[PDB]
């Protein structure tokens, strides 16, 4: 299975040059092209450029002066640079995979065909901050009737993102964790909570993951099933 | 070059969304379609201008010609609400500015609010949140109120945009901060949530 791993999210001073590798699992770089297409915040995608493992990579002609790609075919992974970076260059930067084939007389990519998950590339002076965990013990007073809800606050941290799981993804079901406020002083904060059965409530435990890869940071934090 | 794309196509349910891509002689281009759910990467839908890779179903259709390229999807669910972009190559990629598409005659569903207390590991760091959590709601707005014990309280309070759950509901939070003290100073706190009209409020209060 051929997949696609970013570089993890993160900071990157203003004016630094912004440093990302890709690494390619489950087949070698060879067969494909490989760019790099990024998303800022709230906006549309935008093509930085691609390489082919034995050609040269050629850019987008708006990031041309500020931009290079190359690629390690020894550690199977490509690489990113972008210099000058401003709050501008905040955003996701995807992986991403094109097919090569012989089409209106040339080798040509044919389509962006897998995509990573991205990862977030926030631009900023300021530093990183871990999260505060806090445990939400569920209330003795459902509102829907037979069922309690448990959670997780996940305070003040930065930059984002954070991801959550509970039981180390064996707890799926019930589970939402909402997307991040933006506090005024900058900070994030988010929660994530399981609603289960009333009947089904202190029959296991209930431990919430909490991944903060920009201060490389996990919390695991044990719920304990108890009202108050 | 530029394409362009409306910034939002709707449907009713079960029908046939259009999604169209216009640029100059873009017929004489191939073009390639891409979906983006809430919070996920961007994921090939067609190439080529009509060719489907194997894991996107035969009711999601591309045509490319003259100044025009469309998708089209048939049989359109809620679970198809996605911003969807195009793309072309001419002389280097260019993507048009995406379409938000949106499914519409869904029944309307009041928000479920649960409020949680300041945990007693946080009072002892010598803090407090009151944490309401809303979810379950349709259609997607909210306003977000706060009172301690009967009055209105402005300062700490910070509240998210409302945003698309799985189940094709919505869902948003909001948080109020204060000391320990303000906490246990009165004899309530509630969190009142607005929508279309109506408000639903819950409340808590300081104990053991």
């Known amino acids: 299975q051929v997949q696609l791993q970013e570089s993890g999210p993160g900071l990157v001073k203003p004016s630094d040059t912004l440093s990302l590798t890709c690494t390619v699992s489950?087949?070698?770089?060879?067969?494909?092209?490989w760019s790099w297409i990024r998303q800022p915040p709230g906006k549309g995608l935008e093509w930085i450029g691609y390489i082919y493992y034995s050609g040269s990579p050629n850019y987008s002609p708006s990031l041309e002066s500020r931009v290079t790609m190359s690629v390690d075919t020894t550690r199977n992974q490509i690489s990113l640079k972008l210099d000058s970076v401003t709050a501008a260059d905040t955003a996701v930067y995807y992986c991403?995979?094109?097919?090569?084939?012989?089409?209106?007389?040339?080798?040509?990519?044919?389509?962006?065909?897998?995509w990573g998950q991205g990862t977030l590339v926030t631009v900023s002076s300021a530093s990183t901050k871990g999260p505060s965990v806090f445990p939400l013990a569920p209330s003795s007073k459902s509102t829907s009737g037979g069922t309690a809800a448990l959670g997780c606050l996940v305070k003040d941290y930065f930059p984002e993102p954070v991801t959550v799981s509970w039981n180390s993804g064996a707890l799926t079901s019930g589970v939402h964790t909402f997307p991040a406020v933006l506090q005024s002083s900058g900070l994030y904060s988010l929660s994530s909570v399981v609603t289960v059965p009333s009947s089904s409530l202190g029959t296991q435990t209930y431990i919430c993951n909490v991944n903060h890869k920009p201060s490389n940071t996990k919390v695991d934090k044990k719920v304990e099933p108890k009202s108050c | 070059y530029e394409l362009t794309q409306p910034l939002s196509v709707s449907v009713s349910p079960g029908q046939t969304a259009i999604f169209t891509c216009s640029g100059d002689?873009?017929?004489?281009?191939?073009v390639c379609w891409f979906q983006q759910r809430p919070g996920q990467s961007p994921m090939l839908l067609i190439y080529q201008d009509n060719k489907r890779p194997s894991g996107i179903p035969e009711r999601f259709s591309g045509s490319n010609s003259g100044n025009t390229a469309t998708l089209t999807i048939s049989g359109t669910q809620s679970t198809d609400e996605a911003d969807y972009y195009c793309?072309?190559?001419?002389?280097?990629?260019?993507f048009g500015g995406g379409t938000k598409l949106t499914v519409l005659g869904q029944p309307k569903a009041a928000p479920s609010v649960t409020l949680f207390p300041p945990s007693s590991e946080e009072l002892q760091a010598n803090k407090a949140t009151l944490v309401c959590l809303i979810s379950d709601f349709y259609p997607g707005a909210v306003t977000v109120a706060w009172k301690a014990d009967s009055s209105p309280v402005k300062a700490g309070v910070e509240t998210t945009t409302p945003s698309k759950q799985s189940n094709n509901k919505y869902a948003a939070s909001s948080y109020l901060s204060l000391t320990p003290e303000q906490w246990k100073s009165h004899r309530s706190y509630s969190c009142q949530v607005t929508h279309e009209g109506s408000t639903v409020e819950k409340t808590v209060a300081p104990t053991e």
């Open positions: 489950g087949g070698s770089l060879s067969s494909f092209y």
């Open positions: 991403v995979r094109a097919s090569r084939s012989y089409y209106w007389g040339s080798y040509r990519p044919t389509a962006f065909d897998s």
């Open positions: 793309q072309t190559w001419d002389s280097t990629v260019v």
């Open positions: 002689n873009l017929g004489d281009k191939y």
